Design an enzyme around this catalytic site. Structure first.
Site, PDB file in Angstrom:
ATOM      1  N   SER A 181       0.849  -1.188   0.000  1.00  0.00           N
ATOM      2  CA  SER A 181       0.000   0.000   0.000  1.00  0.00           C
ATOM      3  C   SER A 181       0.892   1.249   0.000  1.00  0.00           C
ATOM      4  CB  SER A 181      -0.908  -0.011   1.237  1.00  0.00           C
ATOM      5  OG  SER A 181      -1.885   1.017   1.184  1.00  0.00           O
ATOM      6  N   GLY A 182       0.409   2.324  -0.622  1.00  0.00           N
ATOM      7  CA  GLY A 182       1.132   3.599  -0.638  1.00  0.00           C
ATOM      8  C   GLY A 182       0.238   4.752  -1.057  1.00  0.00           C
ATOM      9  N   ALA A 183       0.840   5.917  -1.276  1.00  0.00           N
ATOM     10  CA  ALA A 183       0.114   7.089  -1.785  1.00  0.00           C
ATOM     11  C   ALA A 183      -0.623   6.763  -3.088  1.00  0.00           C
ATOM     12  CB  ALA A 183       1.079   8.245  -2.015  1.00  0.00           C
ATOM     13  N   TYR A 184       0.028   5.948  -3.918  1.00  0.00           N
ATOM     14  CA  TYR A 184      -0.442   5.550  -5.252  1.00  0.00           C
ATOM     15  C   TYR A 184      -1.744   4.733  -5.271  1.00  0.00           C
ATOM     16  CZ  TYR A 184       1.283   0.842  -4.117  1.00  0.00           C
ATOM     17  OH  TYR A 184       1.458  -0.402  -3.548  1.00  0.00           O
ATOM     18  N   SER A 203      -3.079   0.545  -3.747  1.00  0.00           N
ATOM     19  CA  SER A 203      -2.637  -0.675  -3.101  1.00  0.00           C
ATOM     20  C   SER A 203      -2.772  -1.858  -4.032  1.00  0.00           C
ATOM     21  CB  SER A 203      -3.341  -0.921  -1.754  1.00  0.00           C
ATOM     22  OG  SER A 203      -4.741  -1.052  -1.879  1.00  0.00           O
ATOM     23  N   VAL A 204      -1.990  -2.882  -3.730  1.00  0.00           N
ATOM     24  CA  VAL A 204      -1.886  -4.052  -4.572  1.00  0.00           C
ATOM     25  C   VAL A 204      -2.191  -5.289  -3.741  1.00  0.00           C
ATOM     26  CG1 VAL A 204      -0.388  -5.309  -6.190  1.00  0.00           C
ATOM     27  CG2 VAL A 204      -0.115  -2.841  -5.929  1.00  0.00           C
ATOM     28  N   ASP A 217       8.336   0.063 -14.089  1.00  0.00           N
ATOM     29  CA  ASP A 217       8.649   1.447 -13.697  1.00  0.00           C
ATOM     30  C   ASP A 217       8.277   1.715 -12.238  1.00  0.00           C
ATOM     31  OD1 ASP A 217       5.964   1.286 -14.289  1.00  0.00           O
ATOM     32  OD2 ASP A 217       5.881   3.260 -15.273  1.00  0.00           O
TER      33      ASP A 217
HETATM   34  C1  SB2 Z   1       4.961   4.436  -6.337  1.00  0.00           C
HETATM   35  S1  SB2 Z   1       5.536   3.100  -5.252  1.00  0.00           S
HETATM   36  O1  SB2 Z   1       4.809   3.116  -4.043  1.00  0.00           O
HETATM   37  C2  SB2 Z   1       4.803   1.681  -6.050  1.00  0.00           C
HETATM   38  C3  SB2 Z   1       5.274   0.416  -5.748  1.00  0.00           C
HETATM   39  C4  SB2 Z   1       4.715  -0.701  -6.349  1.00  0.00           C
HETATM   40  C5  SB2 Z   1       3.654  -0.561  -7.244  1.00  0.00           C
HETATM   41  C6  SB2 Z   1       3.088  -1.742  -7.932  1.00  0.00           C
HETATM   42  N1  SB2 Z   1       2.252  -1.708  -8.955  1.00  0.00           N
HETATM   43  C7  SB2 Z   1       1.999  -2.982  -9.354  1.00  0.00           C
HETATM   44  C8  SB2 Z   1       1.063  -3.279 -10.466  1.00  0.00           C
HETATM   45  C9  SB2 Z   1       0.021  -4.201 -10.278  1.00  0.00           C
HETATM   46  C10 SB2 Z   1      -0.862  -4.438 -11.304  1.00  0.00           C
HETATM   47  C11 SB2 Z   1      -0.735  -3.772 -12.510  1.00  0.00           C
HETATM   48  F1  SB2 Z   1      -1.597  -4.017 -13.526  1.00  0.00           F
HETATM   49  C12 SB2 Z   1       0.289  -2.850 -12.704  1.00  0.00           C
HETATM   50  C13 SB2 Z   1       1.180  -2.597 -11.681  1.00  0.00           C
HETATM   51  C14 SB2 Z   1       2.730  -3.842  -8.552  1.00  0.00           C
HETATM   52  C15 SB2 Z   1       2.925  -5.306  -8.605  1.00  0.00           C
HETATM   53  C16 SB2 Z   1       2.885  -5.982  -9.829  1.00  0.00           C
HETATM   54  C17 SB2 Z   1       3.113  -7.345  -9.850  1.00  0.00           C
HETATM   55  N2  SB2 Z   1       3.417  -8.033  -8.753  1.00  0.00           N
HETATM   56  C18 SB2 Z   1       3.485  -7.424  -7.567  1.00  0.00           C
HETATM   57  C19 SB2 Z   1       3.252  -6.065  -7.460  1.00  0.00           C
HETATM   58  N3  SB2 Z   1       3.439  -3.027  -7.670  1.00  0.00           N
HETATM   59  C20 SB2 Z   1       3.213   0.722  -7.581  1.00  0.00           C
HETATM   60  C21 SB2 Z   1       3.775   1.829  -6.962  1.00  0.00           C
END
Ligand code: SB2
Ligand code: BOG
Ligand code: BOG
EC number: 2.7.11.24
Length: 340
Positions: A32-35, A37-38, A168
């Site tokens: 989780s972050g400002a952006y 969460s995943v 990225d």
């Molecule tokens: C800006 S920083 O906090 C940040 C860190 C990670 C992510 C971040 N974005 C993704 C992510 C997930 C789904 C998508 F379709 C696109 C990107 C993941 C991800 C993808 C695959 N496996 C594990 C995690 N991590 C976004 C921002």
């Protein structure tokens, strides 16, 4: 055939309500972050482990909305084995009027290049394979007139068959940046990313960070010690008078002998490093040229190093209203077609 909206379910995750198609099962938070969460999930439709990202505040402001649109456009365009791509994008909203949340789905990635490499020297064959994939990805990214600008081991996903994807985001931070990027040059060449590849490659070969600077100036001192102080050809392209007079004031250092610095390495690896780690960005090898270099002879296939479709980035120069960015984002969600 076979027309309907999928059936969604709701579940409380990372402090908000997630609403996702039932194909995505066993949601588990991964960050989780400002952006946003995943969550990690299992996609029962494809048999794939996936990551589902719910954006935070996608349309809070013009800048948020343009960023959301940018991210969706980029992910939709990127279709290459060595670059992150999009398995799915969805919203529970049934109309533009209801549209508030954006969810993005990609392959679950659990390890970056650091996580796999663990500060050890890799064999030359293993370095060939990893660097080949990075260059293959960069050829594709660059062909879309995109520059990564901050390529580093944390932005490189690698699985147990050391198959690699350029990201990225992350799953020390400035050690891989092109010197012109650290000097806020602007007018960047795509070879800013080639510098970063040289930094990464050196480290995989030696097990040591190439330019582990303590701070900005130290990083630059370490760079100049290896590659030498700027020559006359480079100095004539510097429009800033203060930059020129500072550079001239430095004690002349020759480029070090890379053969001795990387003594023990495959001489083809050394040759490639000499062509990547050049101070003048105009004289650095390109991704396409590097793929043709003899170092990659066991992997190079000129008929399977694809380039991207033309990428319309005209939106970058537009100043639009929130509802406009939101509607344009909604259009891209609806028009998404999953990969085969
Ligand atoms: C800006 S920083 O906090 C940040 C860190 C990670 C992510 C971040 N974005 C993704 C992510 C997930 C789904 C998508 F379709 C696109 C990107 C993941 C991800 C993808 C695959 N496996 C594990 C995690 N991590 C976004 C921002
Ligand atoms: C993983 C896919 C490659 C990442 C590319 C970095 C993002 C570049 O695209 C960003 O668009 C603008 C360029 O004019 C910068 O805001
Ligand atoms: C003392 C440190 C000097 C660093 C010199 C970096 C030179 C990078 O190279 C420069 O990159 C520019 C693109 O950004 C191009 O416009 C220039 O033509 C090119 O020479």
């Amino acid at each position: 055939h076979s027309q309907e909206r999928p059936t969604f379910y709701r579940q409380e995750l990372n402090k908000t309500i997630w609403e996702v198609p039932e194909r995505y099962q066993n949601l588990s938070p991964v960050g989780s972050g400002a952006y946003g969460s995943v969550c990690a999930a299992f996609d029962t439709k494809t048999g794939l482990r996936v990551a589902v990202k719910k954006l935070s505040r996608p349309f809070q402001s013009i800048i948020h909305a343009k960023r959301t649109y940018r991210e969706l456009r980029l992910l939709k365009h990127m279709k290459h084995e060595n670059v992150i791509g999009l398995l799915d994008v969805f919203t529970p909203a049934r109309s533009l009027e209801e549209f508030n949340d954006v969810y993005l789905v990609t392959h679950l990635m659990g390890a970056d290049l650091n996580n796999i490499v663990k500060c050890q020297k890799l064999t030359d064959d293993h370095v060939q394979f990893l660097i080949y994939q990075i260059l293959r990805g960069l050829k594709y990214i660059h062909s879309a007139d995109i520059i990564h600008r901050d390529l580093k081991p944390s932005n490189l996903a690698v699985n147990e068959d050391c198959e690699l994807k350029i990201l990225d985001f992350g799953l020390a931070t400035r050690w891989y940046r092109a010197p012109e990027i650290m000097l806020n040059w602007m007018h960047y060449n795509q070879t800013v990313d080639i510098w970063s590849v040289g930094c990464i490659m050196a480290e995989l070969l030696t097990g040591r960070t190439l330019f582990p600077g303590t701070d900005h100036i130290d990083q630059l001192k370490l760079i100049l010690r290896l590659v030498g102080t700027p020559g006359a050809e480079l100095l004539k392209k510097i429009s800033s008078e203060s930059a020129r007079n500072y550079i001239q004031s430095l004690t002349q250092m020759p480029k070090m002998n890379f053969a001795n610095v990387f003594i023990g390495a495959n001489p083809l690896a050394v040759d490639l490093l000499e062509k990547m780690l050049v101070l003048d960005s105009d004289k650095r090898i390109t991704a396409a040229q590097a793929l043709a270099h003899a170092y990659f002879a066991q992997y190079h296939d000129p008929d399977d190093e694809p380039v991207a479709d033309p990428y319309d980035q005209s939106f970058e120069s537009r100043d639009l209203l929130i509802d406009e960015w939101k509607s344009l984002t909604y259009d891209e969600v609806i028009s998404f077609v999953p990969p085969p």
